Ligand binder design. Structure first.
Ligand SMILES: [Zn+2]
Ligand SMILES: [Zn+2]
Ligand SMILES: [Zn+2]
Ligand SMILES: [Zn+2]
Ligand SMILES: [Zn+2]
Ligand SMILES: [Zn+2]
Ligand SMILES: [Zn+2]
Ligand SMILES: [Zn+2]
Ligand SMILES: [Zn+2]
Ligand SMILES: [Zn+2]
Ligand SMILES: [Zn+2]
Lengths: 116, 58
């Protein structure tokens, strides 16, 4: 039942059983127009680093660390640089492994990874 | 609806919809006789310090 997140824009009405985020079982994000202390807003994790174990609420909820919220885990820090302290931020930061293209050993083409 | 935590001692049965912790809506703790990787086991927070904000899962 995962539904696409669409920011809520209902003023003068609490995010409770009527906001689209609440109806869609989705946490309110920073792009929602609701109050800054909304019940459905997802809090930013205070992990020391990594954020890859199940203890980190971002990783535990199958979610990448929001740069605006998670500041201790290092997702926000070193935005221009690489080797971020947090590990649940690779999709957002686009730091992907170098793939290589070659004819697959099974069928057709296949992606091969350059480094272990 | 908070109920007192009582450790689960159900061998040969997963902690799912039959364990007392799961029924009582309580996270499995270290005192539970279930596996160390139980679904209902509460993970430990990795906070740098404080753990007083809403960010810390504990
Ligand atoms: Zn809303
Ligand atoms: Zn919202
Ligand atoms: Zn909201
Ligand atoms: Zn984290
Ligand atoms: Zn985070
Ligand atoms: Zn993180
Ligand atoms: Zn149990
Ligand atoms: Zn238990
Ligand atoms: Zn258990
Ligand atoms: Zn903790
Ligand atoms: Zn904590």
């Amino acid at each position: 039942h995962v539904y696409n997140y669409q920011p809520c824009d209902h003023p003068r009405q609490p995010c409770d059983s009527s906001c689209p985020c609440v109806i869609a079982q989705n946490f309110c994000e920073k792009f929602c127009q609701c109050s800054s202390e909304c019940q459905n807003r997802f809090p930013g994790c205070r992990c020391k680093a990594q954020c890859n174990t199940k203890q980190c609420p971002c990783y535990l909820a199958v979610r990448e660390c929001d740069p605006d919220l998670c500041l201790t885990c290092g997702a926000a820090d070193h935005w221009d640089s690489k080797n971020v302290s947090c590990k649940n931020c690779s999709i957002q930061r686009g730091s992907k492994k170098h793939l290589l293209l070659a004819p697959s050993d099974v069928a057709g083409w296949g992606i091969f990874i350059k480094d272990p």
